[PDB]
Amino acid sequence: SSGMSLLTEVETYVLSIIPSGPLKAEIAQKLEDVFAGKNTDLEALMEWLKTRPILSPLTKGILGFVFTLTVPSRRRFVQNALNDPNNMDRAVKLYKKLKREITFHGAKEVALSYSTGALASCMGLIYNRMGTVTTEVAFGLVCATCEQIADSQ
């Protein structure tokens, strides 16, 4: 049900944290294919991600979250990338707040007042609790995380 308006917005946030190069172009193509519904093979996408050079653990965690979110129907490296104790403790409070949000921007507004670590940890929480927030809310969190990372670059 996620329209292309939202999905293209997400593409730009996710790509903003990736260093320029042929790898980024490959990720862009894969993102486009997954978002369009032209690739539903999550296992291969996860193996591809896991074996990629250059990308930071957190970048891989974000990508893994985004793929899992957009493919119809757990992965240890994703959780490990997203999982800091103080960041984890704020993640639960944020998660509870996000459960009550509906929209992309409602979620983004709430999330942006949290640290990158807390946002990553909250993504970890949601990764193991798919369907407990709206897709827009999950994307709002991703984009808030990407915004903070890009602004620290």
What resolution does the deposited structure have, in angstroms? 2.0
What is the rounded end-to-end Cα distance, in angstroms, of the chain?
A: 33
Experimentally determined by = X-ray
CATH number of 78-152: 1.10.10.180
Domain spans, the chain: 1-77, 78-152
Contact by Cβ (8 Å): 141, 119 = yes
At the topology level, CATH places domain 1-77 in Influenza Virus Matrix Protein; Chain A, domain 1 (1.20.91)
